[PDB]
Design a protein around this ligand. Structure first.
Ligand SMILES: *[C@@H]1O[C@H](CO)[C@@H](O[C@@H]2O[C@H](CO)[C@@H](O)[C@H](O)[C@H]2NC(C)=O)[C@H](O)[C@H]1NC(C)=O
Ligand SMILES: *[C@@H]1O[C@H](CO)[C@@H](O[C@@H]2O[C@H](CO)[C@@H](O)[C@H](O)[C@H]2NC(C)=O)[C@H](O)[C@H]1NC(C)=O
Ligand SMILES: *[C@@H]1O[C@H](CO)[C@@H](O)[C@H](O)[C@H]1NC(C)=O
Ligand SMILES: *[C@@H]1O[C@H](CO)[C@@H](O)[C@H](O)[C@H]1NC(C)=O
Ligand SMILES: *[C@@H]1O[C@H](CO)[C@@H](O)[C@H](O)[C@H]1NC(C)=O
Ligand SMILES: *[C@@H]1O[C@H](CO)[C@@H](O)[C@H](O)[C@H]1NC(C)=O
Ligand SMILES: *[C@@H]1O[C@H](CO)[C@@H](O)[C@H](O)[C@H]1NC(C)=O
Ligand SMILES: *[C@@H]1O[C@H](CO)[C@@H](O)[C@H](O)[C@H]1NC(C)=O
Ligand SMILES: *[C@@H]1O[C@H](CO)[C@@H](O)[C@H](O)[C@H]1NC(C)=O
Ligand SMILES: *[C@@H]1O[C@H](CO)[C@@H](O)[C@H](O)[C@H]1NC(C)=O
Ligand SMILES: *[C@@H]1O[C@H](CO)[C@@H](O)[C@H](O)[C@H]1NC(C)=O
Ligand SMILES: *[C@@H]1O[C@H](CO)[C@@H](O)[C@H](O)[C@H]1NC(C)=O
Lengths: 50, 423, 86, 198
C-alpha cells in the first residue's frame, strides 16, 4: 500500500482483523504496520493555495 | 385526501355597506433570506491527479479545462463576498444607540446587541446562529473564509438598527436626523393612512403589542427547528455536492482501479496511461458537473442576495408601500438580524382588527351641493352620519373643514341627505 | 491569519477601508510598503437621540450619481461542425 | 474603472472565446491537434481513432463554452430586466423606493447610452445643514390636543412652530395647520402653547 503523507500513532480502535481504515471519502487514512502491528494514522503533507 | 385551499369566506358586500377597523394589532413576522454560499475552492489538478506527475502530464493534453474550472469557482467565491456586502454594508457610518434605552415604552433589547456576550449578538441573532471537512480537504477541496466575519456582519446589522431606531429613515437618505421613537412611529402611521393621533393616544398599547410580538419571535424560532430551513437547505445542498464530488474519486470509470497510485505501481507507462486516461476523463467530468451546478446554484443565491439587499433598502432604510414586500399587513418598519450565510428580517406591520359594519355613502347632500370627504369616508352608525379615516374608526362630525364641494346633488349615485356643519 | 500565512505584509493596528481583501476581516494595502490590517466598517456616529429632540435640515443639495448596468452581451455564433471538423 | 461593470462583461466573453479557440490546439490524446495532419498521415481505419479523440475533446470544449454562455446570458438578462425596471421607475416616473434610483430622495433620472449597457444619472434631494430643535407630539391649548396636519412641532428654545419635516420652515402654529383630537390628558410629552386662530 503506497502513498505520501505524515504517519502518526493512531487512537483508532482497530479490531484484530482490520488491516487499514478509511474515511468518509473511502480513502485509506490508517494502516496496521505489518511488522509491529502498530496502528498509524495517515494525513497528507501540508499543502494549500498560494 | 383532496387538499383544502382554505376556509370559505363570503364577504358581506352591498352597495352601501363598509367595514371599518375599530382596532389594530402590531404584527411582527420573520423573513429569512440566503445571502451567501460557502466559498469552496477545488484544486483541479490535485483532485484529478493528486501528486502524480504522470497523470498531470496527461491532463495537459486536455488544454485549459482546469484553468476554466479553477476560474469558475474563483468567480463564485468572489461573488459571495459581493453578495454579503450588498446586503449588509449599506450604511455610511456605524451608528450606535444611546446608553439609555428610552424609546417611549418600545423595547428593542431582543434585536439590539447583548454586551454581555463576546460575540456582541442580539438575543435573537444568538438564537439564529445556534440553530444554523478534512476528508474533503485532503483531496484538494478547501474552504475560503468570508471577507466579512460574523462579528463584522453583526456590527453592520447593529449599525442599521441604531440608525433605524434613532433617526428613522433619514440616515438611509442623507445624514442621520435624530427623532423621538414615538414620533417616528407616528410618521410611519401616517405612511399607512392612519393619523398620528392614533399612535399617540394608543402609545402604550402599541408599545406593548410591539414588545409582545418581538418576544413571540424569539419563542417561535426557538421552538421551530425548521424555521431556518431556507438557510439550512443552502448548507445541505453544497455539502452534498462536495460529498458527491469526493465520492467520485472512488469510481473506476472503466479503469482497473480508482486508485491512481495502484495503477502506477502495477503498470508501465504505455499501459498505465490507458488506465489513467479513463480516470482523468471520469474525474474531469465529475468536476465539470460540480462546477456547473455551483454556477447555477450561485446564480440562485445571487438573486436571493439581491432581493435581500432590496429589502434592506426598502424595508429597513425606509417604509415600503409595496404590498407583501415587507411582511403581511401595512408596513411600518423592519429590523435586520444577522444569520449564518443569510439575513433575517423582522417586519413590523399594522394589521387592522375588530372591524364593524357601517352604512356608507359616496357623498352628502346639503344646501343642494354634493359634499365629498377630504380624507376619510362617510359612514352612518344607523342614525347619524360621520366622516372617518378609512383604516381606523374615528367618527368625526361632518363639517366644511373635512369635506369639499363638487357639483350638485343630482349627479352622484347613492348620495344621501345630511347636514354639513359650518364652524 | 485565518485565511492563511501572510508573508511580506506588515501588520498594523490601524484600521482602514478594505483595499485588497485577504479574508476573515483582514485586508492589505500599499502605504512605502504592503501592510495588513483589520478593515474598518466606517466611522462611528453616535446619534444625539432623546425623547424630545429632532434634527431638521435647514438646507439641501442636489446630488447626481451614476448607475451603470449591463444590458446586452456580444452576440457570438459558433459553427459547431466547422469548429470541430473544419 | 468607472465603467468596470461593462468592461467586465466584454472581458468575460472575450476570454471565453479565446479559451474556446485555444482548445483547438489540444491533442486530447491524439497524435496531433491538427486534423489535416492526421488525415494526411493515416488511413481511415486508424485516422478515425485519432479523430474520435479530437471530436470528443472539441465537442466537450464547445459544450463547456455554451453552458457558460447560457449561465452568463441569464445574468445579463437579469441585469437588463433591472435596467428596464429602472428606466420605467426612475426615468419615466419618480420612485419612492429607497436606494432604487440613487442615494437620497429621488427627484428624477436621465438615461445615457453606453456600450452594451445603460447609464442612469440619478438626481436626488439630499438634506443638508440640519440643526437641533426641541419637539413635541402635540400642543395643548384650551384643553384640546393639537396635532400638526403635515409637519412637526418644534421649538427654537423659546417659541413653538410647525415645520415641514424635510426642510426647516418654522410657521406659526394655527388652527389651519393643526387638527384637534381628544384632550391634553392622553398624549405623552404634550406641551402647552398657543394655537392661533386666524
Ligand atoms: C384593542 O385591542 C387590544 C388588544 O390587542 C385591547 O387591549 C387589551 O384589552 C384587554 C381588556 O379587554 C386587556 O386585558 C389586555 O391586556 C389589553 N392588551 C394590551 C396589549 O394592552 C384594547 O383594549 C382594544 N381596544 C379597543 C377599543 O377595543
Ligand atoms: C425589555 O425586555 C426584556 C425582556 O425581553 C427585559 O428583560 C427582562 O427583565 C426582567 C426583569 O424585569 C428579568 O426577570 C428577565 O429575565 C429579563 N429577560 C431578559 C431576556 O433579559 C428588559 O428589562 C426590558 N427593558 C425594559 C426597559 O423594560
Ligand atoms: C516479525 O513480525 C512479527 C509480526 O508478524 C513480530 O511479532 C516479530 O516481533 C517480528 N520480529 C522481528 C525480528 O522483527
Ligand atoms: C356585517 O353584516 C353581515 C351580514 O350581512 C355579517 O355576516 C357580518 O359579520 C357583519 N360584519 C361584522 C364586522 O359584524
Ligand atoms: C350614533 O352616534 C350618536 C353620537 O354619538 C349617538 O347619539 C347615536 O345614539 C348613535 N346611534 C346609534 C344607533 O348608535
Ligand atoms: C343599492 O341597491 C338598491 C336596490 O337593491 C337601490 O334601491 C339603492 O338605491 C342602491 N344604492 C346605491 C348606492 O347604489
Ligand atoms: C334630499 O332632500 C331634498 C329636499 O331638500 C329632496 O328633494 C331629495 O329627494 C332628497 N334626497 C334624498 C336621497 O333623500
Ligand atoms: C498592536 O497592538 C498590540 C497590543 O494589543 C501590540 O502588542 C503590537 O505591537 C501593536 N502593533 C503595532 C504595529 O503597533
Ligand atoms: C445636537 O446636540 C448634540 C449634543 O447633544 C450634538 O452632538 C449635535 O451635533 C447637535 N446637532 C447639531 C446639528 O448641531
Ligand atoms: C425663536 O423665534 C422667535 C421668532 O422668530 C424669536 O423672536 C426668538 O428670539 C427665537 N428664539 C431663539 C432662542 O432664537
Ligand atoms: C423624557 O424623559 C424625561 C426623563 O429623563 C422625562 O421627564 C420627560 O417627561 C420625557 N419626555 C417625553 C416626551 O417622554
Ligand atoms: C398646561 O397648562 C395647564 C393649565 O392650563 C396645566 O394644568 C398643565 O399641567 C400644563 N401642562 C404642562 C405640560 O405644562
Amino acid at each position: 500500500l503506497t502513498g505520501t503523507g505524515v504517519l502518526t500513532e493512531s487512537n483508532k480502535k482497530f479490531l484484530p482483523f482490520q488491516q487499514f481504515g478509511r474515511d468518509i471519502a473511502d480513502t485509506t487514512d490508517a494502516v496496521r504496520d505489518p511488522q509491529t502491528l502498530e496502528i498509524l494514522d495517515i494525513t497528507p503533507c501540508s499543502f494549500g493555495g498560494v | 385526501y383532496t387538499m383544502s385551499l382554505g376556509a370559505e369566506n363570503s364577504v358581506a358586500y352591498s352597495n352601501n355597506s363598509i367595514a371599518i377597523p375599530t382596532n389594530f394589532t402590531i404584527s411582527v413576522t420573520t423573513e429569512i433570506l440566503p445571502v451567501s454560499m460557502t466559498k469552496t475552492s477545488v484544486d483541479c489538478t490535485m483532485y484529478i491527479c493528486g501528486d502524480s506527475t504522470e497523470c498531470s502530464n496527461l491532463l495537459l493534453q486536455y488544454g485549459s479545462f482546469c484553468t476554466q474550472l479553477n476560474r469558475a469557482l474563483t468567480g463564485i467565491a468572489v461573488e459571495q463576498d459581493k453578495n454579503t456586502q450588498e446586503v449588509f454594508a449599506q450604511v455610511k457610518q456605524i451608528y450606535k444607540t444611546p446608553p439609555i434605552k428610552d424609546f417611549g415604552g418600545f423595547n428593542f433589547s431582543q434585536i439590539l446587541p447583548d454586551p454581555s456576550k463576546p460575540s456582541k449578538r442580539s438575543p435573537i441573532e444568538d438564537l439564529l446562529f445556534n440553530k444554523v471537512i478534512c476528508a474533503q480537504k485532503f483531496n484538494g477541496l478547501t474552504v475560503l473564509p468570508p471577507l466579512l466575519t460574523d462579528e463584522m456582519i453583526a456590527q453592520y446589522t447593529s449599525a442599521l438598527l441604531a440608525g433605524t431606531i434613532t433617526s428613522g429613515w433619514t440616515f438611509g437618505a442623507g445624514p442621520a436626523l435624530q427623532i423621538p421613537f414615538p414620533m417616528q412611529m407616528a410618521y410611519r402611521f401616517n405612511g399607512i393612512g392612519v393619523t398620528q393621533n392614533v399612535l399617540y393616544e394608543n402609545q402604550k398599547l402599541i408599545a406593548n403589542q410591539f414588545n409582545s410580538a418581538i418576544g413571540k419571535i424569539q419563542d417561535s424560532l426557538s421552538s421551530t427547528p425548521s424555521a431556518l430551513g431556507k438557510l439550512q437547505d443552502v448548507v445541505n445542498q453544497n455539502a452534498q455536492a462536495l460529498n458527491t464530488l469526493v465520492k467520485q474519486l472512488s469510481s473506476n470509470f472503466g479503469a482497473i482501479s480508482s486508485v491512481l497510485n495502484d495503477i502506477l505501481s502495477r503498470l508501465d507507462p504505455p499501459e498505465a496511461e490507458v488506465q489513467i486516461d479513463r480516470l482523468i476523463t471520469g474525474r474531469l467530468q465529475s468536476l465539470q458537473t460540480y462546477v456547473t451546478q455551483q454556477l447555477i446554484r450561485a446564480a440562485e443565491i445571487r438573486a436571493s442576495a439581491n432581493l435581500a439587499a432590496t429589502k434592506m433598502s426598502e424595508c429597513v432604510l425606509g417604509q415600503s408601500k409595496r404590498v407583501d414586500f415587507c411582511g403581511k399587513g401595512y408596513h411600518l418598519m423592519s429590523f435586520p438580524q444577522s444569520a449564518p450565510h443569510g439575513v433575517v428580517f423582522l417586519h413590523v406591520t399594522y394589521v387592522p382588527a375588530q372591524e364593524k359594519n357601517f352604512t356608507t355613502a359616496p357623498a352628502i347632500c346639503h344646501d343642494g351641493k354634493a359634499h365629498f370627504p377630504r380624507e376619510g369616508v362617510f359612514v352612518s352608525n344607523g342614525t347619524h352620519w360621520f366622516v372617518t379615516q378609512r383604516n381606523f374608526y374615528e367618527p368625526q362630525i361632518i363639517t366644511t373643514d373635512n369635506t369639499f364641494v363638487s357639483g350638485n346633488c343630482d349627479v352622484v349615485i347613492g348620495i344621501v341627505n345630511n347636514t354639513v356643519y359650518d364652524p | 491569519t485565518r485565511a492563511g500565512c501572510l508573508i511580506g505584509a506588515e501588520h498594523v493596528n490601524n484600521s482602514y477601508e478594505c483595499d485588497i481583501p485577504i479574508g476573515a476581516g483582514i485586508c492589505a494595502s500599499y502605504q512605502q510598503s504592503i501592510i495588513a490590517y483589520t478593515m474598518s466598517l466606517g466611522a462611528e456616529n453616535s446619534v444625539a437621540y432623546s425623547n424630545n429632540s429632532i434634527a431638521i435640515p435647514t438646507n439641501f443639495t442636489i446630488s447626481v450619481t451614476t448607475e451603470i448596468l449591463p444590458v446586452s452581451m456580444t452576440k457570438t455564433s459558433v459553427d459547431c461542425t466547422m469548429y470541430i471538423c473544419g
